[PDB]
Amino acid sequence: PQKVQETRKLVKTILDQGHLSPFLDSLRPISWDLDHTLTLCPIPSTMVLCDTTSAQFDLTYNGCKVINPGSFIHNRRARYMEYVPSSKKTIQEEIYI
Amino acid sequence: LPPGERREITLETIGNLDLLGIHGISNNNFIARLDKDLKIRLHLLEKELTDHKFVILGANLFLDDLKIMTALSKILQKLNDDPPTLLIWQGSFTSVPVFASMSSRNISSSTQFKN
Amino acid sequence: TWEVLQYKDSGEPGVLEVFVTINGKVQNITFHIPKTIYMKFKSQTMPLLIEKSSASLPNQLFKITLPESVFLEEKENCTSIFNDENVLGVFEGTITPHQRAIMDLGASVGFEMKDLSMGFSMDIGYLLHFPEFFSLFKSWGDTITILVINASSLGQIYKQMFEKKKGKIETYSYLVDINFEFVYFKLYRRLSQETTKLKEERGLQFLLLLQSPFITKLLGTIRLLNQMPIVKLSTLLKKLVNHVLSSGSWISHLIKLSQYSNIPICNLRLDSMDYIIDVLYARKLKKENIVLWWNEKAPLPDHGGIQNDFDLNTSWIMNDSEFPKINNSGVYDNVVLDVGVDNLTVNTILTSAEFVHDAFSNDALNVLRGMLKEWWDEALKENSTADLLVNSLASWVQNPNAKLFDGLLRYHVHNLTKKALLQLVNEFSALGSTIVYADRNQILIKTNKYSPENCYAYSQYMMKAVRTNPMFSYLDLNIKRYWDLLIWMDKFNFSGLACTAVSQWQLKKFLSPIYQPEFEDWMMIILDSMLKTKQSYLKLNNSLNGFSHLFSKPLMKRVKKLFKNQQEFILDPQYEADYVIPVLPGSHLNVKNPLLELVKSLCHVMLLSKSTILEIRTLRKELLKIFELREFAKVAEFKDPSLSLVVPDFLCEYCFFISDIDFCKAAPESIFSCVRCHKAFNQVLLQEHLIQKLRSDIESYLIQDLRCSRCHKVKRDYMSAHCPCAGAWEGTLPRESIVQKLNVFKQVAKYYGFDILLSCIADLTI
Ligand SMILES: [Zn+2]
Ligand SMILES: [Zn+2]
């Protein structure tokens, strides 16, 4: 499905690129001293890669579990997400409103 | 795109540094090391704590919309029955960006954010 | 139905509840409106209402039209045309339905909007609230409810103010008419309950006037029954009585605004004329087939998704504002014309007149020009509303809260204003004069003439000769002062005789308290000597030659005596407070000898005299000999004791006056109140502008280009270690300059006690 493919593409881009801001500094400026924080070089164990313009997901790639609770209020539901560190499950949750 | 590298492979081939201070702080004469036995002990404790849960709220949680606040009141009322270990709030806590006001009649942008 | 009083959105999408007027009654009614959308593609697709279209974009296009329900249910859910598939972005998708209604229907218009197309005399209610002090009034009741001496003082204050405002009350009596009783205070339930009592006694046929500047507006609409038609508005009971009796004038003014602009009475805001300009510009833009960059949700223009991304041009456009203000310091024995200027921005927009990628759209500019000409002609025909509008344009072109705000438009207007000021200086100088100083509000002009009484004719000729050039047809050129003799180094540091003598010196403020009177004394003596010399030379017929000789020897004798006294008393606790140097905003530097600081100041003021450099210089030598300092010693050199911190283009909304304000070189009264009018600036607004300036400069540091340190080429690549000419890369904003800027910010924050700015400064480091 389109929604799956355009998020596999996202996390594969981010983690293969190894760095949270692949874009040129003339398109997303970085504080030069602090660019080391955006680098992911030992790939994190989990990533809450939050994004309001993509579907929710809880993918895994290279052992990195990347989750996105994309937006709090969407399609007349409140949306929130329960990551469980001692098992790495990711139970999505919603309240209708 | 150049192939990503699994966490273990990266850590073992850079020399297993503590790049966080999870085990110890570094100095210019002393790079902190991510001690294997302590790593294992922590990992076993991590698997032991079945009950810990991190709750992540969605983005664009505008505090200045009553519908957001109503929804959120319901959610937090659920969470008070069984508290998270940790609770990530995030992302743009106001509907408009909060910038230098152009007028003094309305309550100013900064003051509104504080409210 | 064929007249409107209010639009508001229904809960459900695309539907409006509307309050309409016909046959002498208000009626509640409801419309259905489709959402118009524009989309752009590089390649064709048409799966399906959708119409291929043509319209100028903001700096393959299809119009799209749906009821908002089907658009909403499709867009957020399906694999539809609204999702991916070579869209370059939706353009007008942010416009709220009732904000489409106000544009296309207005006041002079369920029911399909498909077939809708392009004398007040009723009751009023009132609910103004002053935070706990909820105030309620009607045009159909003889008592007033004012919540938590009271009644007695109310009665006589009403009587006095009613007597003060009789004619204004009488002429607007037919809109709102008079004495009444009083009452005063879980309590908050009375607000909902007695508003039900209002609704029970007037189901329709009355109009509710909401609130005043100490707002809590949204929570107010939670207390208030949300189904009324509502005119939203944003021992001190004198204020409340005054507002109540002012109501009739507000209704008259709002009727004038509505009948002029075709905006319903509830929807237009008195609090911002910029909004009326937004809707009225949106009409003429869509009528000239421009895709509209209205943005409801955020200040930035809705160019589609592109508006969310950082851009070096965009960030330059937002960060930049400084006029290249001219300041030719000197002494002037010729009469100097202190020319005020106003309506400069309006003049540029009227008199103004892809390859350029930060020029505002020339189509939209042409619309703004012709529309401004229309408003201006109606102001010349004494339309109070059109006059107020043209005055308020200077706010709207800058205000980010304008619905049609665009940084490109702000910048286009701004740099045209800059060019126009330079051309105005060119015009005055082309007529044989010479400019002392110039900025966007003021010009000081050397005349090549010597007598004010001789020149009250020629000055008016000169100013007329400027305004009669078409480039300056609309300028408020105004000869605000005549300077007979002028000493000038900047607008915060001057003295002169006006046609009589005034002196003001930020220089003076840095001298220790014993010497500030001494400075003013010798400045009066300098003016007196210069004037004696001018009038002497003119009786005998650059005229200042020899003015030092009338006072040099007294000044040296005085300075010698003061130097002896300083050696006696600078260390003395009896006197040291008069020798302590003041800490101040922009306090530039440490100083070891305060008398030497006075001498440096006097000598610098006198060294402004280009005609007479030699005699002053020799006197300066003979003065510094008292300290045994050599004539050119680095200590004896005068560096300005003040560091400027200019917040560019501050707006006084009370008189729509745009001014750069310098928190260090300006006196405190000019910081906390306007110079032209004298309304006070709000403290938090002021601090917010300082934090905006601070963060703008930090960002300008981090987004800078690097320049080669020995050949000044720009660094074009991303990963070179040095320029190909072997020069090391360096900043175009060196780090030292930004350290200095943060230092003056911390000084200003400490001195004026700007708690928000000071905590921002704290949060940088910590
Ligand atoms: Zn003012
Ligand atoms: Zn070079």
Curated annotation (Swiss-Prot), chain A:
> Describe its PTM?
Phosphorylated in a cell cycle dependent manner during late G1 phase. Phosphorylation may facilitate the interaction with POL2 or the activity of DNA polymerase II. Phosphorylation is independent of DNA replication but dependent upon CDC28 in vivo.
Residue list for modification Phosphoserine: 21
According to its UniProt record, where is this protein located? Cytoplasm; Nucleus
Domain of life of the organism encoding this protein: Eukaryota
Q: How does it assemble?
A: DNA polymerase epsilon is a heterotetramer consisting of POL2, DPB2, DPB3 and DPB4.
What's the family? Belongs to the DNA polymerase epsilon subunit B family.
Query: What is the protein's known function?
Result: As accessory component of the DNA polymerase epsilon complex participates in chromosomal DNA replication. It is required during synthesis of the leading and lagging DNA strands at the replication fork and binds at/or near replication origins and moves along DNA with the replication fork. It has 3'-5' proofreading exonuclease activity that correct errors arising during DNA replication. It is also involved in DNA synthesis during DNA repair.
* Miscellaneous comment in the UniProt entry for this protein: Present with 3110 +/- 251 molecules/cell in log phase SD medium. In eukaryotes there are five DNA polymerases: alpha, beta, gamma, delta, and epsilon which are responsible for different reactions of DNA synthesis.
**What's the protein name?**
DNA polymerase epsilon subunit B
Which species is the source of this protein? Saccharomyces cerevisiae (strain ATCC 204508 / S288c)
Q: Which gene encodes it?
A: DPB2
From Swiss-Prot, chain C:
Q: Which domain of life is it from?
A: Eukaryota
Which residues are listed for Zn(2+) binding in this entry?
A: 652, 655, 674, 677
Q: Where in the cell is it found?
A: Nucleus
Signal peptide interval: none
In chain numbering, motif CysB motif lies across 708-725
Membrane-crossing ranges are none
Zn-finger (CysA-type) residues: 652-677
Q: What is known of its domains?
A: The DNA polymerase activity domain resides in the N-terminal half of the protein, while the C-terminus is necessary for complexing subunits B and C. The CysA-type zinc finger is required for PCNA-binding.
The function of this protein is: Catalytic component of the DNA polymerase epsilon complex which participates in chromosomal DNA replication. Required during synthesis of the leading DNA strands at the replication fork, binds at/or near replication origins and moves along DNA with the replication fork. Has 3'-5' proofreading exonuclease activity that corrects errors arising during DNA replication.
Q: Provide the protein name.
A: DNA polymerase epsilon catalytic subunit A
Complete-protein stretch covered: 1321 to 2222 of 2222
